[PDB]
Amino acid sequence: RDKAPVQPQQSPAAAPGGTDEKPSGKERRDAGDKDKEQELSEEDKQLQDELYRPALEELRRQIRSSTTSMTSVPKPLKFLRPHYNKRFAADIISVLAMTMSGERECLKYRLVGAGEVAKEWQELDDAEKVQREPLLTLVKEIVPLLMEIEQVDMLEKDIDENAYAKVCLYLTSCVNYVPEPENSALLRCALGVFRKFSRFPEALRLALMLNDMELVEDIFTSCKDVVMLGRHGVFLELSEDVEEYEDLTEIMSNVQLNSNFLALARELDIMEPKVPDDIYKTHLENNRFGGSGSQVDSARMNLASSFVNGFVNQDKLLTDDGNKWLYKNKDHGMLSAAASLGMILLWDVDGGLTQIDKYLYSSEDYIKSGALLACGIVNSGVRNECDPALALLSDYVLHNSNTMRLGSIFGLGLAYAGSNREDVLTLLLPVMGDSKSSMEVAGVTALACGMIAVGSCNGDVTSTILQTIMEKSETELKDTYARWLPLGLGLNHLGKGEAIEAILAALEVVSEPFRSFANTLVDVCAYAGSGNVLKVQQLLHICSEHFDSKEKEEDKDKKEKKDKDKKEAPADMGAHQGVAVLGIALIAMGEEIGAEMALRTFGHLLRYGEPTLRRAVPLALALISVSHDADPEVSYNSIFAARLAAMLRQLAQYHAKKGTLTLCPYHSDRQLMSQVAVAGLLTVLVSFL
Amino acid sequence: EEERSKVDDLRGTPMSVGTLEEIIDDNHAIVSTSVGSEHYVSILSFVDKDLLEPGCSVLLNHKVHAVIGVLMDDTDPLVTVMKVEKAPQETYADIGGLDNQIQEIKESVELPLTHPEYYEEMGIKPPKGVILYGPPGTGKTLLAKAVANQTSATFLRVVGSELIQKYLGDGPKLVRELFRVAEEHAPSIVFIDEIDAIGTKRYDSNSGGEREIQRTMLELLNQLDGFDSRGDVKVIMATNRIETLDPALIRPGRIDRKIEFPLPDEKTKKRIFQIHTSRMTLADDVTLDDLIMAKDDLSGADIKAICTEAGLMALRERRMKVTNEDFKKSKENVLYKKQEG
């Protein structure tokens, strides 16, 4: 109707006209009024007036909430103590209490730091449990633990909307936009409601982000309570890091309850179903052995081809293909070929000893040292290959068993990940105290103790890596030491959630840009990735640093950091000119499934002229795809037809055919512009089943 | 560095716009540009002397008229009619129950680009394209297939031979560039909607006779035949009347595929209907089944557009909710639309 009968009712100040007009306005409050509430300029004078004055607070929050305010709007509701499935309930509850209580939670969440906003927050939580459309109420009620009692208060009936919808969008947006400390509340209260619930790989991805040891005991009494079985042994062992299968095999070495979790969840039963079934359902032919194994000769390309043939795995045929192929081979390639029988067969525990045993203790140092390297390759649960190598290791400067130290300290780094294995590190004290002029002694020292030490409890600054810091800064020689020791330093820094070890090594370490490059290595490895863009604008500024190798690793951190929100991962690094930066993006594509935009970047990155960068393209190019596939390969044949390029092409052919185990060895590969002695360890980036 | 501050004087002060025409094989390029002015340019920079090619434009000095640089300029009606871009939001999950029809073209939309390997592992080379058809008026339901194909590569949809029939040939030529600019955009996909060539008879503007319109379609395939073109542009083609097309279009391509569009059945109409009313809130008495259960031989467009009549009166009352009391009674209007119209 017209506002002529109802409009001058705001003019009197008598109590009965208010106490019946406000219930009369409550009936018309289903649409608020006729219109956009142009009573405001006349009824804002009624502020100073004071029985049913909380109903006057309802009118006042109704009209101030009706037009616009950020702090004075929820003040009549916090003064009101709301009192006295509907359209009106959707109005004053849904949009008005959602937006109004939302700005009260934001304004007091940023302002003060009461219980009133907790009571209103639980009331709105209950009202949106009535409304039952989550998603927006949830993401609003994150920013007020509050979210803990919100989840256990909310979770009674609906499982997959809160679990799938809430835990999907808030897990992804929590690692994406939100900083870290509330993600622990996600993980713990999600451990509560998922502890109530079935389909346990939600809790196993909670074990992925948590890395908790109680969780695997609860999910093994519960996932033994739910008797597939060896398959969750498989992605259990794939999912788990270095620590919790050794803590798991020690507390389950105590209890075990059927001993089949000691069978599955240490080793050997992720791997017993696969390799026969790998032979069975797949049938791989011979003309890539012969054709791709025919790609000419030259003891390099041929040597690489042995590696390519070797990583073929239809039987361990290229293993037992005669003799005179390794006799053509030379020292560090003899390491690569002695380890290549390791690479053909990362299973066959009993067959590993009886195949490598001919090449064990042979006439050649590289055959025996790469042979124990192969013993470290084939398995990770044997630990009886240690002692024939372990006993020999000491040489005190540069004898044979230091190369067995390289293959056996590295291959034993492949072998075990304990709570903290300490006996092998007490063996590692005369290794770094030995300090051979061979790089990969301290190389596989840092990398191997890092593989022992990735997933440490927020890292540690213990005397192991503290000792290799002090003995690192002891000798400033052969800067590959100053690169690959901060490798294993940052590997021990992995396992962090909140580590101040960048500040600790910042105080101990920093100097002339060898150890400032150590500073940027700890800066890389301590910062795995979250919504933490301040180090990304730090990346923007110190990306322009005149020393152009802290540029290399510091800009190289990007594929670790933004690996999930990968749409921003295309950047203009190719549009820059510091050619190692084009190398950095060339790393940053990598190996996943590799969409058309990535191969489109390999359109330009495929065509470059420097042999380390033209060498650098087919590696990640054929890692990212594990004609179509062979079309860029024959395009590389069109590129060259140097020797490096030929080797790079061979590597690409090999490629053609946050788990830390796939995170380490390519950052171990990042110093490739060097000797084949370095490439003797190039075959230790064991990141594929 | 210094070269930039050196040849700018030779360029300087201004430079004209020429039209690249022909070459003396010594690389002295004879051009006809307004008005018909020639020149001879063998100059060392920025060329790429070969590929600038006859039938293009150049930029000439004043003294004396040497082309020091070239451009690719469009704009033009050529590039404009192909694009942009788009990828509308609809998907191939929208049309259910016909999956047997799209699962056929699934490998046809998939195998090029995505999942290419078993094409060349078989090595049998099936890059033959597709043809489409169906009753009564369909092909936007096939656009519901085509709106899904936007997830891969790049696409252009064209309608008819109309650009030829607007005037005496003119040849195919506007189709020629549209065919060979798809080579410029290759790999891509191009589709022509509901070929009306001899299906429809009369022309707009001036055209004739039959043979010049017959041959511009005959050249359409004969250019696509082709001699000898690998270029894809995987060719999608459709007309809802299989009669009027010259049957010889099938054998060169697409040979293997012309999709048959089945008319909707009872449960397909049920599968289709709720996708619309999912967003439009129905009242309590509204039921999907009974209405379309009694109604026969509908179209997906109608069963989509039957909800719009309730989007009037309920929106005339400004109501978010559909009412079957209207949706029944208002359906008579769309029923009157099919019955009397």
Swiss-Prot record, chain A:
The modification Phosphothreonine is found at residue 19. Found in skeletal muscle, liver, heart, brain, kidney, pancreas, lung and placenta. Coiled coil: none annotated. One of its GO terms (molecular function) is enzyme regulator activity. Residues 5-16 have a biased composition (Low complexity). The keyword Acetylation applies. The keyword Acetylation applies. GO terms for cellular component: cytosol; extracellular exosome; extracellular region; ficolin-1-rich granule lumen; membrane; nucleoplasm; nucleus; proteasome accessory complex. Residues 1-47, 550-572 are annotated as: Disordered. PC repeats lie at residues 336-369, 370-406, 407-441, 444-478, 487-516. Residues 19-47, 550-570 have a biased composition (Basic and acidic residues). It comes from the Eukaryota. Keywords: Acetylation, Phosphoprotein, Proteasome, Repeat. GO terms for biological process: proteasome-mediated ubiquitin-dependent protein catabolic process; regulation of protein catabolic process. Signal peptide: none annotated. Component of the 26S proteasome, a multiprotein complex involved in the ATP-dependent degradation of ubiquitinated proteins. This complex plays a key role in the maintenance of protein homeostasis by removing misfolded or damaged proteins, which could impair cellular functions, and by removing proteins whose functions are no longer required. Therefore, the proteasome participates in numerous cellular processes, including cell cycle progression, apoptosis, or DNA damage repair. Binds to the intracellular domain of tumor necrosis factor type 1 receptor. The binding domain of TRAP1 and TRAP2 resides outside the death domain of TNFR1. Belongs to the proteasome subunit S2 family. Component of the 19S proteasome regulatory particle complex. The 26S proteasome consists of a 20S core particle (CP) and two 19S regulatory subunits (RP). The regulatory particle is made of a lid composed of 9 subunits, a base containing 6 ATPases and few additional components including PSMD2. Interacts with RPGRIP1L. Interacts with CRY1 in a KDM8-dependent manner. This is 26S proteasome non-ATPase regulatory subunit 2. It comes from Homo sapiens (Human). The gene is PSMD2.
From Swiss-Prot, chain B:
Residues 1-11 have a biased composition (Basic and acidic residues). GO terms for cellular component: cytosol; membrane; nucleoplasm; nucleus; proteasome accessory complex; proteasome complex; proteasome regulatory particle, base subcomplex. It is found in: Cytoplasm; Nucleus; Membrane. One of its GO terms (biological process) is proteasome-mediated ubiquitin-dependent protein catabolic process. It is a lipid-anchor. One of its GO terms (molecular function) is RNA binding. The modification N6-acetyllysine is found at residue 166. There is a cross-link at residue 145 (Glycyl lysine isopeptide (Lys-Gly) (interchain with G-Cter in ubiquitin)). Keywords: Acetylation, ATP-binding, Cytoplasm, Deafness, Intellectual disability, Isopeptide bond, Lipoprotein, Membrane, Myristate, Nucleotide-binding, Nucleus, Phosphoprotein, Proteasome, Ubl conjugation. It comes from the Eukaryota. Its main location: cytoplasm. ATP binds at residues 134-141. Component of the 19S proteasome regulatory particle complex. The 26S proteasome consists of a 20S core particle (CP) and two 19S regulatory subunits (RP). The regulatory particle is made of a lid composed of 9 subunits, a base containing 6 ATPases including PSMC1 and few additional components. Interacts with SCA7. Interacts with NGLY1. Interacts with PAAF1. It is linked to Birk-Aharoni syndrome: An autosomal recessive disorder characterized by failure to thrive, severe developmental delay, intellectual disability, spastic tetraplegia with central hypotonia, chorea, hearing loss, micropenis and undescended testes, as well as mild elevation of liver enzymes. Belongs to the AAA ATPase family. Component of the 26S proteasome, a multiprotein complex involved in the ATP-dependent degradation of ubiquitinated proteins. This complex plays a key role in the maintenance of protein homeostasis by removing misfolded or damaged proteins, which could impair cellular functions, and by removing proteins whose functions are no longer required. Therefore, the proteasome participates in numerous cellular processes, including cell cycle progression, apoptosis, or DNA damage repair. This is 26S proteasome regulatory subunit 4. The chain holds residues 93 to 433 of 440 of the full protein.
